[PDB]
């Protein structure tokens, strides 16, 4: 038994609630933080997994694995498989028509299915829960993307109880989304809800319709391939090139050097988010050389426009595949760390004419919030 909890395993940060005492409490991890990173790192002594697993990345490239859920319930010639292989540093292999992670580790090599490295960051995700409760934790409501199929939702569910949590519901991202804002009770004649969901590695808009607190995806659009990443990938090159003026120079080439600067760019992004400039400094980036530079927002919102401005595309399109009319959405959500971003926020609401957003629970906190509940629910406890 003890409290269920609700988990966000997420494609690049992972969050996990727990209700009690009427009130959902996102809980912070060990260094303070209230997501974590979906990453696992493989050295020649330990095994490390979120925080500690991604702020080694730029010194242990090949052997930190994140990006599982692109490959979680996937075959390995799966074609979205196969072009992805092309952009992940560590090394992936087949394994009689299944898709595996090859690492080194502690000198040997070893080799781990999807399931295996989300069961990793479900086990971290398990022991921030327990840090918190000063309890077991056993049970757990877990959440998948809308469009996932049996499949990917098995082997989640397995992710599951190879962590050795017992899966009470695997629940899709947008529902919990809308159930952490109490949407799933609100007067019988039927809603409709946006959810609008850009994460770190992929964007999700649902529409979901909502029938005495029965919950239907009407349609969902997006991009596998569009988040806070790009948008960091978009000043990691106004930054080299930046470097080329001031310093003479060409850091392009260097793994290491564009990490460290991948790093700070990300970092500076949140800023600018609260702020309208946040500086960069970076001890010895290029052979011995420091860079201390600054961003503003204006002109992050300048390198990042037409991905900005196109996050409305699929928007247009969810609501003609659910054949719905703008002023038809009652309620539009907010899911994922880049909805922090005012210029997304000022193009989304614009869209809607001024209609209000969902935006007072964390965006990044939302999905595991939702789950939280549900779970209690699932519980018997709410
Ligand atoms: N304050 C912020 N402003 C802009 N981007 C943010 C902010 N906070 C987090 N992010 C971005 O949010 C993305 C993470 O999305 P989130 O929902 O937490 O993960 P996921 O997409 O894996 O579920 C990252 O690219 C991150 O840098
Ligand atoms: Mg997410
Ligand atoms: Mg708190």
Known sequence: ??????????????????????????????????????????????????????????????????????????????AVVQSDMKHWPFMVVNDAGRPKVQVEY???????????????????????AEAYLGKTVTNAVVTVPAYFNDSQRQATKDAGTIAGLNVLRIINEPTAAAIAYGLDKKVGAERNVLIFDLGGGTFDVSILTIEDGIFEVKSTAGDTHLGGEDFDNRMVNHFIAEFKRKHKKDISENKRAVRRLRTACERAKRTL????????????????????????????????????????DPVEKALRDAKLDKSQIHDIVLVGGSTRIPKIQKLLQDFFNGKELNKSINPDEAVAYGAAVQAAILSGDK
């Open 1 to 78: 038994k003890g409290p269920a909890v609700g988990i966000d395993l997420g494609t690049t940060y992972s969050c996990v609630g727990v209700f009690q005492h009427g009130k959902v409490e996102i809980i912070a991890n060990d260094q303070g933080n209230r997501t974590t990173p979906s990453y696992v790192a493989f050295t020649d002594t330990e095994r490390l997994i979120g925080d500690a697993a991604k702020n080694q990345v730029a010194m242990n490239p090949t052997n930190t694995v994140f990006d599982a859920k692109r490959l979680i319930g996937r075959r390995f010639d799966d």
């Open 273 to 312: 988010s609260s702020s309208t400039q946040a500086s960069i400094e970076i001890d010895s980036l290029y052979e011995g050389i420091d860079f201390y530079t600054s961003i503003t927002r204006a002109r992050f919102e300048e390198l990042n426009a037409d991905l900005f401005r196109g996050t409305l």
């Open 106 to 128: 502690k000198g040997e090599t070893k080799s781990f299915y999807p399931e295996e490295v989300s069961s990793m960051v479900l086990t971290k995700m398990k022991e921030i």
